[PDB]
Symmetry: D3
Subunit: 338 residues, 6 copies
């Protein structure tokens, strides 16, 4: 997949394409409908499937620092776009172009001159041009005879509208199961493992891995979750008895640094039945189900007792998760008991 920053970076010799346009944060099941329809139509005519997306978030342009939390990073948005068959992502920055343009010159400059589009796919909510004047209906009538438009209704399922907004609310509530249901996969983050308390190994109270994330990253509510930790492909040695590219059962503790300026979430992972320390590695943490709310501890004995209960509840939730195999990982490690 190609990645282009700005209209100017798109090759001039690109001759035909089918195009979809949106923020696409999270690439939820609704987003997958637009991508699916785009890819299928591009196959039909032997053209390329292009996603046009936006960075920084269009909201943060008008209201700096008050933009919605990112369900995925830009890098992950690229990876997901690839995994669903996109051939090229064009990234638009509204502080550089396409903001003050009229609806008419938007279609002309972007879809024709730049992308040589024959088909375009948008959601019913889609807007464009100066002061958001251009709508889905605008696009249909501006494109009559020039190129075909397909407008897809927003996805409703089980009485819930599937959008970036609702995925954020589920995450914020700590309801990762409903978020996963809306995403069509386990919600996850990735990042380098740093030093934390003690060292991963024989002692249950020390995390197997410690990660930190900036405050523009959407994460579930503080608390403990069941999920899967995966060491990303690597040739570097691993301390202890975990192997790379295997999804390990884990109790995951999401927290907020006290106090800190720009707080600032932590993720501490207790991998079941393994003695390991993952400093240096890039690690993926997938969330499956909520286990408990955060609490304060007044003794080591009390802390470990609750730790053991988390493990027990995690074993149960993960043994269920494996049975719904469309979300569960290919290669996993889960022991029947301790």
């Amino acid at each position: 997949m190609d990645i282009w920053y700005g209209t100017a970076a798109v090759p001039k010799d690109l001759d035909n394409s089918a195009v979809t346009i949106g923020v696409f944060d999270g690439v939820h099941r609704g987003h997958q409908k637009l991508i699916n329809a785009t890819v299928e139509k591009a196959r039909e005519v032997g053209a390329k499937a292009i996603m046009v997306t936006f960075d920084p978030h269009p909201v943060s342009v008008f209201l700096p620092r008050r933009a919605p939390l990112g369900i995925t990073t830009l890098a992950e948005r690229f990876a997901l776009a690839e995994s669903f068959g996109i051939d090229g992502v064009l990234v638009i920055d509204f502080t550089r172009e396409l903001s003050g343009t009229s609806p008419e010159k938007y279609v002309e400059f972007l879809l024709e001159d730049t992308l040589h589009a024959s088909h375009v796919v948008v959601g019913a909510n889609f807007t464009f041009g100066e002061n958001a004047a251009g709508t889905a209906d605008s696009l249909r009538q501006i494109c009559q005879s020039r190129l075909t438009v397909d407008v897809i209704d927003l996805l409703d399922d089980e009485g819930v509208r599937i959008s970036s907004t609702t995925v954020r609310e589920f995450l914020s509530e700590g309801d990762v199961a409903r978020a996963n249901w809306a995403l069509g996969r386990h919600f996850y983050v990735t990042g380098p493992v740093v030093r934390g308390a003690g060292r991963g190994g024989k002692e249950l109270g020390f995390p197997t891995a410690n990660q930190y994330f900036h405050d523009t990253v959407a994460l579930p509510a503080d608390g403990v979750y069941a999920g899967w930790l995966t060491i990303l492909p690597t040739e570097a040695p691993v301390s202890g008895n975990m192997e790379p590219e295997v999804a390990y059962a884990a109790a995951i503790s999401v927290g907020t640094n006290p106090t800190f300026g720009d707080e600032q979430r932590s993720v501490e992972s207790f991998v079941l039945d393994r003695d390991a320390d993952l400093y240096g590695h890039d690690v993926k943490v997938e969330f499956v189900d909520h286990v408990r709310a955060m609490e304060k501890f007044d003794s080591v004995a009390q802390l470990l007792e609750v730790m053991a209960k988390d493990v027990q509840k995690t074993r149960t939730l993960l043994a269920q998760d494996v049975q719904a195999h469309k979300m569960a990982p290919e290669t996993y490690f889960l022991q029947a008991e301790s």
Copy 2:
């Protein structure tokens, strides 16, 4: 009007005066009674009308950093004192003088030796001297035959006591209309316009003006308000189609910087039906009515839609405000529609 810092700066040759004494924060309608009575009595005898006020706030002397929010700056207190006919303001600092003095030596040093007073005007709540022992009744009996005292009852109107305390509560609640009612004018702030998001002009989502204020400044609750923006007299050029000294209709957005140490309010102004950028100018923002509470936005389209509703509601409230002309500005700009 003269301004003196400390008793020592008052001219020795000042021969007669009528004097009023208080913090006077906000110069509300109650404060106006004391000033009115003072000015009128000074006219009668051809003497000067003097306000004795306090800076820093007397409370912050005993409880540093825990002083009440300033309804007006000291500079604005001066301007308001002038506008009501005060001839001289004497500013007292309680860390320099008049704190540990007895009630008797207070009258002697300040009213006689310093100010050569023949008349003094205070509110029923007035206290003075060491450990606040001297009261309004004290002042009457210490001044028998030496000079005339006039003690004015605190102002009650429509079942509400008018004081600095109540004005602060109204502001804190976001009830600017009741605050205005108590002040006898539109509440306002003034300050330099700085750069913010994008540039003021053709795009509705970019503010016409951005200002910041320190946390000792009383401001209405976070939210959106109707009011009037006025560019203060200036010879410097103005970007766009606003003229100086004209009060322009505006939707005003009061906010709190996230997160910041010493937060730290913002004021963003969207001037109706004008394309302009006010970087560099000193700007006055008057508040008229509350419009809505603060909210988070998840798309540009959703943001602009609410923006347009704010404008609609503002046009209505301001068209009413103009009809109560005792508060409304002399020269204003308000279009009947967009």
Copy 3:
């Protein structure tokens, strides 16, 4: 009393001892049972009474920065241990030793090899060894014939379990009287007196003393308390009319610095009927009873009026406190009236 940091610092020639083991934070009435039983048994056999305690808090080892607030500092834990007849305190750091050790090697290394114990005293809640596997019952059966064990039940009185946890809740609620009841003494802090607002002396509104404490220090809820201030023994001169080593009646104001990073409690003390300034001295503040919640003030007169009410209520509570003489200080100053 000796103080040893680590097993290595304990003298090799120590031949016999009776030993008690715990965090001992606060040395509450429950803790006093263990110490009493230990001291009495050591007297019987002419051996030394040893406390084995822990620093840093064992919880902060597994959960850095999320450890319980310290009811007493380590230094005060030493002083209290001395006052109840302990001959030696051994301080253990779990990042250096005794964490990953098995229950068996724990007893062997610490109690025998290091301390040459013939008697050991623990609470029913006591745990030890890797992953907290060793319990009170473990200790009894591992020590059969090698040394005598005495396990003391946790202290319940008036329907309340007396523990560090409950003492912290009482303090956090502002219920110092119930905390005192559980500690078996007035709760107190000690520290150097620094400069604050104005100077201690003739003016009631200026504190007689200002202290600051870090955020790992347990303190009562923000508000005003009755208690006793004592200048610790010193040869340095004292400004005003307080003498060292005399417990003076005082209204105590506990607060939280606005805003600050790592906030960060203040203690401001208004000593009844004395004019003094205590800059430079080390001062002990004992708490007796809650008086009122924190409030904001809008004038000097209003502030002083409430100040005087605090004094009145304090005089009453302290006159009662003196009557329960098992908590009250030996030498005190309390005037019948102002």
Copy 4:
């Protein structure tokens, strides 16, 4: 004078203009040559005189937070442009447009479509377009018979090159006299007066005005300077014996207070006043001395009085040399 942010804000009905293009930081005597030639050629064809300038600084686009210090604020750049008779300022942001454009397309879009220029005036060092390929020469050959091009050499006077760079050097070493000579006027800063030490009054040691500035503002090296302070037009009352719109003799002390801010403290000669809350203009004339530490009040006041004598002399010279002094001023021969 109009002020347009971006090509999109320029009036569509602009039929003819004479244009000058540059950063114009400081509006020095070199810059004044470009504007003068532009303003005069604009009168000839009855057209408007336009300045195309840039904000943020072009360097800061490539090297964030490592841009040259601003000799004047953008606000002051506008006011100086107006004072030399410019009719419109167009402000280009390089993160928005005209950056990755070709040399050929830059000319067409800016000078032709947007500005409808018949004449353009640039400095010999001018460059434009993608990777700065377009030079002083590129402009001549690309414009042909469409618009007349005038390329002015950089200014050398008394064997000294006059540019934004040399001005910044002069300020940085504390040679305000040379900066001023290069600028064509007294270097100045403008800002609101805040609270400081004590109160302005009878006491010599307390400043008449305190001001703080961000680290992006070029200021003379830390030290003491002779200058003029002016209270900007206002109806707000003034504490003490000073009126607005009169330039008053002052000893000016520039300092630093890190963790950024530079401070400017003004001791107005033979006046007792406190200027808290006013907008105040401070002009620099000559260097007086370096920064120093004081260990007693007496020592500090002794040095303060010398600063006053030296200022008195240097300002009397400034008034006689005439060509740079303020129209309305207040200065005493002695105390």
Copy 5:
């Protein structure tokens, strides 16, 4: 000794006193001349000896946060005054009173109404009143037959001027020997001992005590010094083999840790102890070496052992020179 904050706190029934006036920072040998003359003249007329001093520092009123570093804390200034027999300290704040006053009114209010002085003792450099017009001479002519004035010249010894200024220079270069000679005693700081590296015990590399100080405290230049550490009177238990009120031989390492704080780390010779929580007095005797970086543990311990040898020698000299050594001390000839 009494301590009064402001003229208003002075007893109304004070009928007669002998007075000395000054900053008195450091209470050096020059200052001791003023106090000695004051204390003796007070005994003669059966009166109390009063020190009038100033806090905050007079310079900091005019130049906030740019005041000279304090040689001693105000607390230590009180204790030194008392030790030389002063009966009362009056502390004047210049933001409160006596600042904008005339020379004539200053004398009347302070010396007459408040203190009822019959005799006053000042240094030849003394000044007072509005804009420091009142000098050593002003005081003589204004007091006439009301109170006797004694003006003492500043102290020169061995061709060196002894003042707060010169003491601050000596400390700043790390010449504590000269500072001490000027002071009349070992320079010292006092503070609570906090946690640091490891625990004080058998290990040579871990300090016996760690202390931090604010940036307003004058300290010797970063480096290693020979000195004495004393645990201040206490009933609190001491971890290890040290008693209170005995001055122990120590190698002292002064360092900086910015973003302000200066640190003092004490390595007590031939002792294993940890002084966390105690109040501790640290006296400086001689400079040993400059600060340096270490790249291995072995290297650091090798230098540490040399610091110990050099301290041992220098302290044995201090004990024999007698006139400045502590009454009760602990020092070993060898390890």
Copy 6:
């Protein structure tokens, strides 16, 4: 290769090993002598080759936050060990164990009980035990007939001593050529690429990759360097015309941005790409120039183009000298 944190994590069933002990920061040519002798002697007795190393740095235990800068991260120390054939790394924390131990007990516990060593290899400067009493010699006499000891002298080559210390000096002055010669390879850092100025693309002035590093990471002095950039193995898409696992020619600009962080900005020659989100390895070859300030875009691009020419030359030399160049690379003769 296994990695054990503390003696307690070492397998109980380890019957025989050959052991080397040291900080090993940088794994330079001196260190490679120890490992080589260890790995070979381990093959002889069919045993595993073990490295005992230390984290945190031993100096930082005694002197917190004043430890030497790390030549490599601990992660990179592991990977280099593995590359030279070590079978196990044992990591000792001195705050946990082996610190206050006697020389005699250190040997027994670590080498005997834990590691069951038949052979040990140390550097001539090696020390151990309480207060570093145990030396290179102590080890010989304490081990006797239990385990064979081999003590290797420190490396001198071309009259230059090769140690962690000298490497840190070379880097700090910006002489990466000498650092590399001492290291046996190109010095490198590895990290995630974050957003910076503009976007990597057609524009020369925008970096292909931006990276930040903590102040504990040794880096060459601020300036411009010739080097190679490699995108580490990944399936994640790459924006622009670069593939992973190819070392690309780059001009590398090292800078500082205080209040700590050092920055590394890479300008990849003859490529248009943006590497945001990838893991990227940056190798340093030669110094090109010192840091400088720019006052115009044209000036900056002029210097940028010179940096490219000088890099082109220096890298062509690196490729021919062969012994240190990457296996797979991309470099153009001209533009």
